[PDB]
């Protein structure tokens, strides 16, 4: 149609083409214009002319007030970080140095810089630079501690709710508890002095910290406490933040009726306000796909991580931890979904991507690098079985052995010996030893895996049953201890149908194993007794398979706020 360009979009391209002469005068332009000049520099690809200005804190304070075009700033910021220049670490250090100089000032200048820190530290934390956002908040925190009145106590607890969030994406859990304890010190002081603070966002972080350390018993306790303080006056960003973390603790609690209403309300609440492109919406989808994968709704769990990844791949550039986290979970979901098929080439690409990103931006001994490392190892051991080349079978299976042990060490260093995540690596390493023909070694890993999970989770739980089936296949298919395997298969059968029914698609490896269990010990009557149940499993799975996609399952306005909270709280 050949429509001419607006005079604005023409004057933008004429001051950018004359940027060297006009760099001094551009910084004096209004915020809406100034960001559009800088975004034009990114569009032209002149990142050096741009990162020379974002490294200054004052300019990055001006381009942080453009809230409409923040989604363009994240892609412009992430492009700088991959370009070279450490624009995140320079901004965080340049703020801490400037923040440390106004300690001997009044409460007007200090509140000006604290608000800069809350939008800068609120941006680096949003872009994934948790190790660099914490340095901003730790400087904002020490501004609130200087003045000990009722006014600044509400900001010190506003830093500690954010410090507790940048210390979980950075997997610094052992500092998280000390942060929460310091928050209560600034909460009890404020609450006692005739001013009650909303303790809803802060307890939501503990619903993810204690979830991360596999304290699901403690996670659900703070899940209830978080939602008891949900008020309609809270920001939607805070409210959707509590819901997604509350869902993750409820799903791992293996109760799914209360879990769906929390996260489907969260996805709706993060889609009507934030829209289908804001990273927070994709953040909710990532936790929504956690619900789908644990309820055996694996078919549409891949489609919700792919949606979650595609949002983050557009807002958060190439090499970002948030993109890498989506690559990790999508690789795991594609691993689970296509486990039966045995084809892992898209899943391997996603798992390899999540390591090519995290190893670039995180140290070699980071906990989040360990969880993303186990997913490649799970994929590698299946390729090391499906491939028919013995040389490839041995070497690829050995590579997956170094990844689990490296992943186990990082989990064992921070989560301790007695945790589900540490035991989750024992079970994965147990399955690997089964494929490595080390059936003697595979016995003691699963025994240590079940004993840790049984002691912590309980005698009957979904995670315990899924670990037993790993041991049951060991005692049945390649160790010939059918008497020992007889109770193990039955143990997982009861738990498997306890929370999913007979149509649980994971029972295929449980029912078929029972058929091979009875094939070598006689009693062929029970072979047909389990043979029709496998057909019953076939009938009860494909009939319920036909269901609409979860993206439209939430639809438009399914329920209302302050109603899902009350419905969940009373139950």
């Amino acid at each position: 149609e050949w429509i001419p360009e607006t005079l604005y979009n023409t004057a933008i391209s004429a001051v950018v083409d004359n940027y060297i002469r006009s760099r001094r005068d551009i910084r004096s332009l209004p915020e809406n214009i100034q960001f559009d000049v800088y975004y034009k520099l990114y569009q032209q690809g002149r990142l050096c002319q741009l990162g020379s200005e974002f490294c200054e804190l004052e300019v990055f304070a001006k381009v942080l007030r453009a809230l409409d075009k923040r989604h363009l700033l994240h892609h412009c910021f992430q492009a700088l970080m991959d370009h070279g220049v450490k624009v995140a670490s320079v901004l965080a250090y340049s703020f801490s140095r400037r923040c440390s100089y106004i300690a001997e000032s009044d409460a007007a200048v200090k509140e000006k810089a604290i608000q800069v820190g809350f939008v800068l530290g609120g941006f680096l934390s949003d872009a994934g630079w948790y190790s660099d956002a914490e340095k901003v908040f730790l400087s904002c925190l020490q501004l609130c501690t200087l003045h000990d009145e009722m006014l600044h106590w509400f900001r010190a607890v506003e830093c500690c709710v954010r410090l507790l969030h940048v210390r979980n994406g950075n997997c610094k859990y052992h500092l998280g508890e000390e942060t929460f304890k310091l928050a209560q010190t600034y909460m009890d002081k404020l609450s006692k002095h005739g001013q009650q603070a909303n303790k809803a966002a802060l307890y939501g972080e503990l619903c993810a910290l204690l979830f991360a350390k596999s304290h699901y018993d403690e996670a659900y306790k703070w899940c209830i406490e978080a939602m008891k303080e949900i008020t309609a006056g809270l920001p939607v960003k805070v409210v959707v933040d509590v819901l997604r973390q509350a869902s993750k603790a409820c799903v791992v609690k293996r109760e799914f009726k209360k879990a769906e209403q929390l996260i489907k309300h969260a996805v709706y609440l993060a889609r009507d306000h934030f829209g289908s492109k804001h990273p927070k919406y994709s953040d909710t989808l990532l936790d929504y796909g956690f619900y789908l994968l644990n309820v055996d709704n694996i078919c549409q769990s891949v489609a919700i991580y792919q949606a979650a990844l595609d949002i983050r791949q557009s807002v958060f550039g190439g090499k970002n931890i948030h993109v890498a986290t989506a690559h990790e979970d999508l690789a795991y979901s594609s691993y689970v979904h296509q486990y039966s098929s045995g084809k892992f080439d898209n899943a391997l690409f996603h798992a390899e991507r999540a390591i090519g990103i995290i190893t670039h931006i995180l140290p070699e001994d980071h906990l989040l690098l360990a969880s993303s490392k186990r997913v490649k190892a799970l994929i590698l051991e299946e390729i090391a079985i499906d491939c028919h080349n013995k040389e490839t079978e041995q070497r690829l299976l050995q590579e997956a052995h170094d990844l689990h042990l490296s992943s186990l060490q990082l989990a064992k260093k921070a989560f301790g010996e007695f945790n589900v995540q540490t035991a989750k690596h024992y079970g994965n390493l147990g399955r690997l030893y089964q494929s490595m023909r080390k059936f003697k070694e595979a016995e003691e890993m699963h025994i240590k895996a079940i004993q840790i999970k049984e002691q912590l989770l309980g005698q009957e739980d979904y995670e315990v049953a899924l670990s037993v089936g790993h041991l049951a296949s060991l005692y049945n298919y390649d160790m010939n201890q059918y008497e020992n395997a007889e109770k193990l298969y039955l143990r997982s059968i009861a738990i498997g149908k306890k929370l999913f029914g007979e149509g649980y698609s994971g029972l295929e490896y449980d029912y078929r194993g029972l058929i091979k269990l009875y094939n070598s010990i006689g009693n062929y009557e029970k072979v047909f007794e389990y043979h029709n149940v496998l057909s019953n499993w076939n009938r009860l799975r494909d009939r319920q398979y036909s269901v609409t996609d979860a993206l439209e399952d939430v639809s438009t306005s399914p329920q209302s706020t302050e109603e899902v909270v009350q419905s969940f709280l009373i139950s």
Binding site: Y335, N428, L466, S473, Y477, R512
Partner: peptide
């Protein structure tokens, strides 16, 4: 395939 989905 006999060990179900890896945890």
């Amino acid at each position: 395939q006999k060990r179900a989905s890896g945890q």
